[PDB]
Ligand SMILES: O=P(O)(O)C(O)(Cc1cccnc1)P(=O)(O)O
């Protein structure tokens with residue numbers, strides 16, 4: 001993959017990211033800078049880096065090789081890491097609010113002895129690092145304000161989606177009537193689709209001088225649909241994924257979430273199955289979670305997911321045929337290969 | 341006061357702030373927008389509004405009356421509310437991390453039944469509103485990027501200071517050796533001084549076209565010292581203030597904080613008093629907190645605070661004589677009257 005090709009340089013740039021972000025160590029703040037380094041090392045490293053790498057890959061595909069000078073590539077890697085940092089900020093807070101146990105194969109940052117709710121400020125620091133890096137590397141570039149505004153808008157969208165996620169999933173209060181297809185789509189559009197797929201491609205676009213509203217709207221048409229599929233896959237894997245592969249233990253059932261699985265359950269369930277779901281959803285008891293999983297297996301939801309992935313793939317490819325131009329289709333095809 | 345004069349118009353502008361921030365209610369996000377309105381109403385309203393009002397007061401003093409058109413004043417009120425929103429974001433998170441009970445006379449947002457750790461995302465939303473308002477009202481102004489960068493830098497500084505605050509105050513781990521005057525000054529400079537006093541005056545300066553590095557450095561010399569005094573007063577009031585007046589219950593002793601009071605205690609304590617402090621600090625027991633307060637009263641720390649306030653006031657006034665020019669001294673004198 002073009003991603004496998006770009007990764008080494010990308011991952012190697014992290015040591016520079018950390019060095020530059022700890023280099024204004026103002027000796028009086030050194031203890032805080034040491035902490036920031038620990039937060040960065042624990043939370044921004046250990047993933048697949050696909051969102052950050054997308055900035056780098058798309059940049060190479062959209063900027064003419066003659067314009068891909070050493071300093072331009074450095075900026076592209078930096079902006080890719082800003083995308084990973086935004087994700088890091090959101091995940092550290094999300095793990096607290098979802099009462100999660102593990103992430104990327106290790107205990108969630110907030111669960112670490114001695115961290116706890118201090119993680120809230122650590123997450124805010126990750127967010128702050130984005131704008132520090134943008135100033136340090138891109139302040140003199142004509143796309144500087146476009147990138148600042150893109151990251152801020154992306155944060156606002158994600159926060160609105162998180163609000164909807166949490167509102168639809170009140171603890172100890174099970175009302176399955178809330179869990180509709182229309183509600184689901186709205187939640188996932190905001191909480192995941194914007195920052196996961198649109199953000200990195202849009203960043204590369206701005207860096208290539210592609211700032212037109214029409215071009216961004218067309219890219220969105222593809223990328224927001226990709227983001228939706230990806231969140232549906234995340235929901236499926238929450239229950240049916242191998243945590244050795246996913247790196248995280250699922251909490252959606254216990255947490256009373258408007259998951260794609262519960263929505264599809266509700267679409268197919270008989271009145272009797274509905275009551276079983278109602279009596280067992282949103283509760284910490286392992287036996288109750290197990291009855292929900294059994295109901296999902298009884299309704300062939302794994303098979304339903306497999307079909308949906310096939311149909312979604314074909315849909316996004318049709319959307320690439322319609323909306324990719326004038327951008328190289330490879331920009332979208334590479335990302336599609338990576339997520340499906 | 342000039343503050344009492346400017347308040348009504350300022351507080352009345354909040355209804356417009358909320359209307360504009362809920363006006364992109366995209367009907368699918370309406371539940372989230374209703375929540376945002378609740379967060380705004382609960383957390384941004386009920387204080388004295390001195391930081392926001394400082395933007396408005398300083399704007400009127402720094403911009404020529406002929407340039408204080410209706411739209412310019414609207415922008416100044418909006419930017420004042422952005423300052424209050426930044427404070428709101430920081431306080432909602434701080435109350436979680438400090439395990440606080442009340443704020444502005446009411447239960448802390450996170451302590452409210454049904455809120456809990458969802459407050460983390462609510463706080464992120466408050467932060468996001470700042471940049472929404474700056475775009476909506478100031479995007480076409482020549483100071484737009486200066487304001488974006490000022491608020492982001494202010495957030496980063498505050499987050500670094502919060503990191504130091506929390507690092508120096510580990511729960512259940514009492515080491516009084518950490519609590520030095522040098523450490524204290526560094527903590528408070530970052531966590532409070534920048535956003536509390538420098539931020540609002542600097543915002544008004546940028547809005548008046550006063551963007552020079554020298555002018556900002558000179559204003560900082562006054563304003564960071566004001567911010568330090570104000571945090572020292574906050575620390576004093578944490579234990580000795582009337583919560584009916586302060587609106588909040590103190591937690592510094594229980595929370596093992598590097599408070600100005602503990603630092604001054606350590607400066608005066610005999611070896612015997614040192615052991616009493618050591619045995620009683622950083623613990624939830626009311627009886628232990630009471631022994632610490634008794635030690636502080638025995639060492640005449642209230643009297644020490646009173647003297648420090650007198651000496652600090654005279655110092656900041658000397659700094660105004662040195663550093664105010666070419667700005668009107670009234671800009672600083674009004675703020676000084678408000679805090680001392
Ligand atoms: O990785 P997670 O926790 O499965 C998740 O995707 C993380 C996440 C956080 C914020 C926005 N979007 C996704 P969630 O939505 O909580 O299922």
Ligand SMILES: O=P(O)(O)C(O)(Cc1cccnc1)P(=O)(O)O
Pocket residue numbers: 430431434435438440498502531532574578
């Ligand atoms: O209002 P509080 O909680 O007394 C405080 O001033 C709030 C605060 C939060 C963030 C930055 N600076 C002050 P703290 O430092 O926690 O004593």
Ligand SMILES: [Mg+2]
Pocket residue numbers: 094095098100
């Ligand atoms: Mg989660």
Ligand SMILES: [Mg+2]
Pocket residue numbers: 094098165
């Ligand atoms: Mg979540």
Ligand SMILES: [Mg+2]
Pocket residue numbers: 234235238
């Ligand atoms: Mg998930």
Ligand SMILES: [Mg+2]
Pocket residue numbers: 434435438440
């Ligand atoms: Mg506090």
Ligand SMILES: [Mg+2]
Pocket residue numbers: 434438505
């Ligand atoms: Mg605090």
Ligand SMILES: [Mg+2]
Pocket residue numbers: 574575578
């Ligand atoms: Mg305090």
